[PDB]
Design a protein around this ligand. Structure first.
Ligand SMILES: [Zn+2]
Length: 273
């Protein structure tokens, strides 16, 4: 799951805000080892591949639930009737709405906790992880809080730091491209005719700008495709290189795992040089 699916999920569930938890269950809930009955949903937000849920209750500690949706991971809105099978967590609210988590990493974050944890971009305290999420929203290409100028400045630092690694590895760095996943990175690389094996240091100013524009364009297209489906329409195909045997020009493609991340990338050796 990658952008803009995280935003889409957020937009679908955020109107559960201000409602009370009547019942809650599932293995992922038990694992957190905290009673959340009668807590109130204060706020939802998202940053990259993380969706955050703030829960409050009078005279009780505030908690944040962090969700990382894995492959075929979803948070679904339903009711008591809906099937619960295979769901990691079930939350029923006071208005009979039921939220169901599937195939997701679910973590309790205590904002007052100073224990060190590993996130998808660093190692930091639990408290710092929550604070960082607020800052990382500005770097999320699909987020409404995206800040172009701050993103560009931030990106320039990362280009200097990760100069030695291949471009695919850098495009998947969740500190600099939060929300970007395997499909986006290779679609963008083909769109800009850049070889995935090319090092970051060997990419010039206009082409990094080119990559960022391509990434945001494809995210826009994916989001627009969702908007079409919602109204009962079909937007049409938009993928050009993902799992394709032939590039749209007709060249034979190469498909293998690359980089330290070892993610499977399809590229055209002719078009992308
Ligand atoms: Zn080609």
């Amino acid at each position: 799951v990658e952008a803009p699916r995280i935003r889409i999920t957020y937009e679908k569930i955020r109107h559960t805000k201000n409602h009370r938890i009547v019942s809650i269950s599932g293995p992922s809930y038990k694992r957190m080892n905290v009673d959340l009955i009668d807590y109130i949903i204060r706020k939802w937000w998202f940053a990259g591949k993380y969706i955050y849920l703030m829960l409050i209750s009078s005279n009780k500690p505030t908690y944040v639930i962090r969700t990382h949706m894995m492959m075929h991971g979803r948070i679904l809105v339903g009711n008591q009737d809906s099937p619960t099978k295979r769901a990691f967590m079930i939350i029923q609210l006071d208005n009979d709405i039921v939220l169901r988590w599937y195939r997701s990493q679910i973590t309790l974050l205590d904002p007052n906790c100073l224990a060190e944890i590993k996130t998808n971009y660093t190692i930091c305290t639990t408290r710092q992880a929550i604070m960082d999420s607020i800052k990382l929203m500005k770097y999320d290409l699909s987020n409404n809080r995206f800040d172009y100028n701050l993103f560009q400045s931030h990106l320039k630092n990362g280009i200097n730091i990760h100069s030695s690694e291949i471009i695919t590895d850098f495009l998947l760095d969740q500190e600099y491209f939060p929300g970007v996943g395997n499909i986006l990175q290779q679609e963008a690389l083909y769109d800009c005719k850049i070889l995935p094996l090319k090092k970051v240091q060997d990419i010039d100013e206009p082409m990094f700008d080119c990559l960022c524009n391509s990434l945001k364009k494809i995210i826009d297209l994916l989001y627009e495709s969702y908007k079409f489906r919602e109204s009962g329409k079909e937007f049409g195909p938009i993928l050009r290189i993902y799992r394709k045997s032939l590039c749209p020009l007709g060249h034979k493609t190469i498909r293998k795992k690359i980089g330290l991340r070892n993610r499977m990338t399809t590229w055209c050796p002719v078009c992308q040089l």
